Amino acid sequence: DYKVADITLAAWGRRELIIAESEMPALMGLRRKYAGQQPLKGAKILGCIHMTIQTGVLIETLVALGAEVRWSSCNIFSTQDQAAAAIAAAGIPVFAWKGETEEEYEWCIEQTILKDGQPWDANMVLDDGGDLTEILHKKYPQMLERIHGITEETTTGVHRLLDMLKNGTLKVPAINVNDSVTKSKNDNKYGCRHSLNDAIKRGTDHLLSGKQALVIGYGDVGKGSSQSLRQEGMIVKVAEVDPICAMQACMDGFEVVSPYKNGINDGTEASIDAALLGKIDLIVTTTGNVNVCDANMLKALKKRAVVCNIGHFDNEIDTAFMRKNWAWEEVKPQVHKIHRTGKDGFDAHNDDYLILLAEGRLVNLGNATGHPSRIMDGSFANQVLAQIHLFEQKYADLPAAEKAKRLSVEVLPKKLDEEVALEMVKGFGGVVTQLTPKQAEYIGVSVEGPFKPDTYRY
Amino acid sequence: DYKVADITLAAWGRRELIIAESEMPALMGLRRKYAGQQPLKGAKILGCIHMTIQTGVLIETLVALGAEVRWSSCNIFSTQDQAAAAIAAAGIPVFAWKGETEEEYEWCIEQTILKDGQPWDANMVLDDGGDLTEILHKKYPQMLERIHGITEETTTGVHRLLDMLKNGTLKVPAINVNDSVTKSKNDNKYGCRHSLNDAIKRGTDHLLSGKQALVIGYGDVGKGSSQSLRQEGMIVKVAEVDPICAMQACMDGFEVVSPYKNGINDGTEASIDAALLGKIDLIVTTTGNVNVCDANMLKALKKRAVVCNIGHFDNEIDTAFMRKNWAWEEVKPQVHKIHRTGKDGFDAHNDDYLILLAEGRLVNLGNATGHPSRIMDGSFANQVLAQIHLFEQKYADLPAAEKAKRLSVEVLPKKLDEEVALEMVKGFGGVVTQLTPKQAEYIGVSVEGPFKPDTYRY
Amino acid sequence: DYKVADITLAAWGRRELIIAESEMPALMGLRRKYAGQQPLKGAKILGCIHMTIQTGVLIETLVALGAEVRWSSCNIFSTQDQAAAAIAAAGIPVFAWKGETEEEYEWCIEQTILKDGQPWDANMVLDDGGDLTEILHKKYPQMLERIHGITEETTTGVHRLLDMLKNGTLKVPAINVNDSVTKSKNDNKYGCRHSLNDAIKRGTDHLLSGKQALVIGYGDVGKGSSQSLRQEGMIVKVAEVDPICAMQACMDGFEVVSPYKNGINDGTEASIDAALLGKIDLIVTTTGNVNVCDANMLKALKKRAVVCNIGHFDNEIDTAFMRKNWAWEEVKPQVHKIHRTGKDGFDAHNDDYLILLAEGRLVNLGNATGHPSRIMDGSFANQVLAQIHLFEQKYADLPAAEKAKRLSVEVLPKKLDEEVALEMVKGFGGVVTQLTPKQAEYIGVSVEGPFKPDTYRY
Amino acid sequence: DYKVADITLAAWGRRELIIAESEMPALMGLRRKYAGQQPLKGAKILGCIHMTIQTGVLIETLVALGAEVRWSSCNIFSTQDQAAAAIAAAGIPVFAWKGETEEEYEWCIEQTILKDGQPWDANMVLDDGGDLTEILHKKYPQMLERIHGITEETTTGVHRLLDMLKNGTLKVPAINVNDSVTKSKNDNKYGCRHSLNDAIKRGTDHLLSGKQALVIGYGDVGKGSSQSLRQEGMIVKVAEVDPICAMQACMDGFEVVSPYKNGINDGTEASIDAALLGKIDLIVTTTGNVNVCDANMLKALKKRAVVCNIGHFDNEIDTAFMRKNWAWEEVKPQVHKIHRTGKDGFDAHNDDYLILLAEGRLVNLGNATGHPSRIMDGSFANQVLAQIHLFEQKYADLPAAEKAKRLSVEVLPKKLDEEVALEMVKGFGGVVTQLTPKQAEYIGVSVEGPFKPDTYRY
Numbered sequence A, B, C, D: 001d002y003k004v005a006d007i008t009l010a011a012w013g014r015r016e017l018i019i020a021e022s023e024m025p026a027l028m029g030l031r032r033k034y035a036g037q038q039p040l041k042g043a044k045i046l047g048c049i050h051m052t053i054q055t056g057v058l059i060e061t062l063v064a065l066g067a068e069v070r071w072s073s074c075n076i077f078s079t080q081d082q083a084a085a086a087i088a089a090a091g092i093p094v095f096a097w098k099g100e101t102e103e104e105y106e107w108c109i110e111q112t113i114l115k116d117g118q119p120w121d122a123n124m125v126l127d128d129g130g131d132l133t134e135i136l137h138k139k140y141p142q143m144l145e146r147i148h149g150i151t152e153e154t155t156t157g158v159h160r161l162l163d164m165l166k167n168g169t170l171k172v173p174a175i176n177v178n179d180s181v182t183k184s185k186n187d188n189k190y191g192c193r194h195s196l197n198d199a200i201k202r203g204t205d206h207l208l209s210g211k212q213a214l215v216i217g218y219g220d221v222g223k224g225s226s227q228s229l230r231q232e233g234m235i236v237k238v239a240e241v242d243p244i245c246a247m248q249a250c251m252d253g254f255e256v257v258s259p260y261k262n263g264i265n266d267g268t269e270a271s272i273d274a275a276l277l278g279k280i281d282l283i284v285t286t287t288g289n290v291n292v293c294d295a296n297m298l299k300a301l302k303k304r305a306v307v308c309n310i311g312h313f314d315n316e317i318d319t320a321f322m323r324k325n326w327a328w329e330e331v332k333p334q335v336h337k338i339h340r341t342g343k344d345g346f347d348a349h350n351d352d353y354l355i356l357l358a359e360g361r362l363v364n365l366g367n368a369t370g371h372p373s374r375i376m377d378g379s380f381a382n383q384v385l386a387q388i389h390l391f392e393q394k395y396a397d398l399p400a401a402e403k404a405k406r407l408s409v410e411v412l413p414k415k416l417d418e419e420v421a422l423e424m425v426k427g428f429g430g431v432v433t434q435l436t437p438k439q440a441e442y443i444g445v446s447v448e449g450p451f452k453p454d455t456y457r458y
């Protein structure tokens, strides 16, 4: 049987299955590359990362390559059902219709870890945020001895997985994809460069040419954000603590400034440099820190400025002081108006106010549609390709004197990375050259790769 | 001890070093930050890196931090005739000759090691040719009782150092200054970008907007060259063997093409796509391979095409065939003109000819000054920090029991690297903010300590 | 009695006015500067422009200067009920009905000029499309003996006015804005630059980095269209019929290619450059001519191409051929996909389909919100300033000696266009330098301008 | 006869003529099609256009198209050494003085019209400097009745030609070519974009990325200049006095500021805005005015500033203030140090100085080569067609009554300029589409005639 949200939905976004796969070539490419050859024939995966319209392509690719899966929703949104119902009518069992709240979602996890009540025959494990990893070790240690390997897609998981192997209660070698080059550059730098200036201009519907903006942090996301703003003709400034990133911002062609006098923050009203902040129309935070937009910073700001964030946490901007002492008003289904005069009793004609695109939540999710289909494709192919290396080694069948030697968390090998890069290049229409045997011996490389060392910095 | 190429040219060199000083922030940022406490007093330094308009600042900085030195040059032809006399004008000695002979090359290299007639108690040696770090062991293995470390800037000598570490004949620890980010970003990416189209236009004065050019390789130099071409209004094509670099090119808004039909290189003219090459205005090679531009590429080019090379290797373009078959002719004291009519007896104004810029060697050989003072600062800065770290950790004065743990090659720690950029960012007029105690403990790094892990690629 | 259909929507309608007026510094500056003098005291005005939001702001603007207006719509589709009811509650009846049978179009035009039972005083006429201007010359000519002036903003209206002046049936002087500088530059070049890449992403969500597009037409609209796609990361090509404009395309960085063999079209399929059309992804048409994208262009396109028109009407792309051979399918009320397989049905999994955006009609204002408020600001400021200057001369009471002498159709004085520009720059926060009395005569112009000749090309 | 310093320079001059010959598609495609038919058969042309190696092909095609030509240099310094001999070897008399004095070329003017003392019976003047036109009526009023066509180059000549027409002193038709389309956007817009960064880098060798510059004026030269700095990673501000071009600058991504508070210049130190002049380090003056950069902003400028000029005279920047209190020093042939300390106290270790490149004169022609050959191809091909069009009208053969109305001063017709553009494009490899007869009437034109109205701004 099967239960996700309902049955009849087949035409809302289900047609995007054809559209997205045509816009995401790497998954459609490697499927033709491995036909007849079935590298994953007999693998049992459960699988849970982020259910979307552009996520079922992973399930289709694993099904084509011979894997066996049973999908359950992860978090935040259980049913992005735009094409979830098509899975069940095809034959794949999918369970997501639950008692819909965020305090019970373990009941969504409980149904993917097992089939009938006995723990499943899992040999590789597919989960994003580790929401599945502790369940095996803390609750159901029985099946766990048969697992060849596991993989995950965030720092929130690998952090414990490294600690949870340090104590020795991890019994399974793990593979981390977050260090793959085609994932780091795609998901972080490029995903924002398309989504950000779109998301800003959908809610405000304002003109961005000729205005001045501030960007907090110049990490991996800061580069893409600054590129997206500069390509529209804005005047962009950058705030940073890392000297290397400040160097790379100066070289790239940006001005770096400090939101505080001399970069020293002490909480006093005499420390915030009002002159610079009194002429800024936009501030965006990228840092993965806490309380980066101080309250005293936020009250010396220029009239009618715009507040935004693309970071991770809800306390990048001091919203605790924001949801108090000042009034709130909704103008559109996703943007808000806040008055600086006082707690309550604002006038319609008043001049003093600000605007908040997503309060403290990420703008590209509340005001946009996440990431485009092509950019995020450079990571789901790593998802389907990491299982290849794990399923070929049969870790659960090795002798004890051999298992103890090769139990470790590892990074994806660079040959699979080159293969996925080539397959996603061939979708654009490019042609890759090849080296004659005389040239290879001169450079010291094989013909089928890899071409670069592990210490290389792409 | 004033045995210099010419003694009367100091002032001009000094005056030109003044502007470099104005354009290299870190060399005096350190000289002002660490002044007074004298961290490098008592050290003995002998080095041979080419004496030019920018290495004098390094030499002056090391002698300014309190040490005493005697100097020589690796390459005699790399000696600058002006600034060499500036060293001769003071008590600091030098052996910067221009004898034009390789017989005296080994005499000048040898003269560094000895005091005058017995070898010097060198605490360290810094090298760029790799000849010094070998002559300590081939010919004079008795000073090593007084050495503390070695420094190397070049590649192909670090390979020798690694092989020698496995050989076991070394007695000295080694610092790999090459792998610094401030070293990598400046020389590879930034340096080529500023000087490539500059040199092209200096050499040929050709209008570049509207042309179509093909770039071989998309490495660091390839990235520095593609943007420098495209910013001028040129349509750029890119070729590559590595799928990752080709993908990076595709996401930047380029086209990936192959000189061969389906990318397979057979050598015969029937395996060559002459359709593409009949409308290409420029061919530049950025790689470090061998025979990249094969003899049958340049036989089927369009008339009046431009060929040049920007990689270090001297045989990436087949000039042997051009010497074998076709005539040569000089248009300017640096540029040459090649006729395809035959070996000799070229016509006065025949239309079938090519143009070659610098005999297929480095475009920086005689057309441009190479890099400005502000870009090579990423290399000169780390050299003094390596010795600041090395001098205090006294390997020689350490007891023999504990010395066995210090034989290795060290990549410069990230903490020292961050100090270098803070001087360069501060020289541009920017400001770097600080961390409150709440924020530092929140992410896991101290207020003053390093910020990024070692797996993080910038 | 005012008649705006849902008359109880005024309270909801007035909401968006308070936030829109802050994004047009020009009209607010006109209200702030010319208050107290009451420039338009006693000047009754008839009007026809459509009403969405900002024309209501203009209505609020000129009535603040002492004027009186009656009003109706022009475009039939631009009948946002919310802005009209706001002004109706603000104090003057409005007649913002839709076309219906086009009699209520005339009836609302009728009531704009006709009271309960008689025509009555009227001085200014502010039309959009020349619909009322015909009615004054025809129908009711006895009222023209008191009519004071006419203002129009379309290029099809200036041609009719000049043709009318040739015949001599014109009776009252007229002023036209479309040939002005700020109006044309903000409407044509800018705006489409801002709006095109916004409209493409809203309807398709596709990635734009590293992709190929073809643009036909390189006029004023097409020049702004091309830059919108370039900054997003496409490789675009320009097709042009006029030798002068194609010269700028090559000098801008775009290769100029023709869709036909040697550019000669003769009605045969063997006359097209087939090697080019089987490689394009995006087509944008920016002409005003019939059959610029002929039936052979589409029949040789690459599969999965997206087409857009920002030109004139459904004659540039041969939709007539497309609606007797090819079937249509709906996706969402922005886009369609059109199958080249045939007419009698289709299968959803085919690859030979074509993507259509805002079928056969303008896209930048069809699948988007059009130009933002800051760009429409300059266009609306010209007409309200025209009614000012066209009032002092007092045409209606001039004697016959001068009444027939001043009958002319003319573009705005250049000084008025510079007054509009000053308020726009002060909106962004810029500062304009002043000329000292020893520095303005060198150019030959007074301190207050205008500083440019009538034949200058900006 | 010949005033060349040495006649032995022609041998390599012809070869350099050949190598520069391939860079001008227009001057060769005009002959390449007009050959066979003789449009200038018997046309005795007298010319004084600036002779250079690129104009060698101009002279050669003009004499190969049927005309006979005598030459001179109406500017003392506008001469390239090789071309004079390289074209005198063919038998064409050239009187260009390499002695470079005033009265010597003044003598050469009066012998440029004398065959042997009997004036040359020429029918036309291809004038460049206008002094010939002055002495036509001033020195020998006898040839006013002989010649029947004049074409001139500089706007300082039309400033006399088109207003002295008021009395009909020269009853001869003349055509002005400066306002032509293919010249209005070749010499000024794209030339500066190509040449400005090369000019600054050849003299300074600085690293442009990361610096802060200020460009004053936003004309065509200003529009071209700004992009050449933005593309080099520079952050720059734009100031102006004309509101409309400032409005354009706001849309191009530049911030508008003023060196004086509120924009009012009152001639005292209390008005200079010290906030921004303490951080800018490069000045480019792109406007033709006096005291655009007066003394106060020079006294308040930062130490590391570089002063550049792209105007015409030495009045845009106050050079007189420099010489009477500040001493000058040279380090590069056209780079100077402006020591702000004063006359005496000349210390070398100073940080208080400025960098002035071309003494305040036009920097581009003082520090770099100048315009490329392809850019100059469009600027020179117009004179040929102007002379030809004045030949095909034959003013001297018309009856005297009809000669009264044929007298007029009119700009070049549009069709000739369109043909120039067509010839220029095909040198880039572009292909232009032809109009079919049905679409020709829809716009309302013929299939080869002019397509744009006479007042259309491109």
Ligand SMILES: NC(=O)c1ccc[n+]([C@@H]2O[C@H](COP(=O)([O-])OP(=O)(O)OC[C@H]3O[C@@H](n4cnc5c(N)ncnc54)[C@H](O)[C@@H]3O)[C@@H](O)[C@H]2O)c1
Residues within 6 Å of the ligand: A187, A188, A191, A216, A217, A218, A219, A220, A221, A222, A239, A240, A241, A242, A245, A286, A287, A288, A289, A292, A310, A311, A312, A313, A362, A364, B433, B435, B439, B451
């Ligand atoms: N919205 C999305 O689609 C999306 C996608 C992926 C990741 N993210 C999130 O975006 C966030 C951005 O992280 P990243 O990848 O840029 O990290 P990063 O490692 O690349 O660097 C973060 C930057 O913040 C800077 N920073 C930290 N504290 C600072 C402070 N107090 N002041 C100034 N600068 C400070 C660091 O120096 C660094 O430059 C992450 O938390 C990630 O989870 C969002």
Ligand SMILES: NC(=O)c1ccc[n+]([C@@H]2O[C@H](COP(=O)([O-])OP(=O)(O)OC[C@H]3O[C@@H](n4cnc5c(N)ncnc54)[C@H](O)[C@@H]3O)[C@@H](O)[C@H]2O)c1
Residues within 6 Å of the ligand: A433, A435, A451, B187, B188, B191, B192, B216, B217, B218, B219, B220, B221, B222, B239, B240, B241, B242, B245, B286, B287, B288, B289, B292, B310, B311, B312, B313, B362, B364
């Ligand atoms: N001229 C300069 O200023 C300068 C500066 C630094 C380095 N270099 C030299 O340039 C060379 C490469 O530059 P780099 O430092 O960026 O190294 P790199 O290894 O990153 O560049 C070589 C690139 O070419 C690619 N490549 C290899 N073989 C190829 C082939 N047959 N066809 C096409 N592409 C091919 C490689 O995959 C790589 O992307 C080295 O020899 C280096 O020493 C020159």
Ligand SMILES: NC(=O)c1ccc[n+]([C@@H]2O[C@H](COP(=O)([O-])OP(=O)(O)OC[C@H]3O[C@@H](n4cnc5c(N)ncnc54)[C@H](O)[C@@H]3O)[C@@H](O)[C@H]2O)c1
Residues within 6 Å of the ligand: C187, C188, C192, C216, C217, C218, C219, C220, C221, C222, C239, C240, C241, C242, C245, C286, C287, C288, C289, C291, C292, C310, C311, C312, C313, C362, C363, C364, C365, D433, D439, D451
């Ligand atoms: N959507 C909007 O926001 C908007 C705004 C203004 C104007 N327009 C429309 O744009 C058009 C006016 O454009 P413009 O103001 O740039 O005027 P324009 O005359 O400069 O544009 C026409 C251009 O297309 C070229 N062209 C004409 N026929 C061609 C052909 N067969 N092949 C190739 N090129 C051809 C012309 O040479 C010219 O360069 C009109 O159709 C008008 O309705 C749309």
Ligand SMILES: NC(=O)c1ccc[n+]([C@@H]2O[C@H](COP(=O)([O-])OP(=O)(O)OC[C@H]3O[C@@H](n4cnc5c(N)ncnc54)[C@H](O)[C@@H]3O)[C@@H](O)[C@H]2O)c1
Residues within 6 Å of the ligand: C433, C451, D187, D188, D191, D192, D216, D217, D218, D219, D220, D221, D222, D239, D240, D241, D242, D245, D286, D287, D288, D289, D291, D292, D310, D311, D312, D364
């Ligand atoms: N070097 C070259 O290649 C070249 C080419 C063309 C012309 N020129 C010469 O140099 C000058 C540049 O011509 P252009 O095409 O730039 O002319 P332009 O008239 O098109 O532009 C000059 C601009 O400067 C503005 N301006 C005037 N006074 C100003 C002031 N005090 N401060 C700021 N802005 C001010 C004007 O409003 C105008 O917009 C010409 O006068 C000509 O003699 C040089």
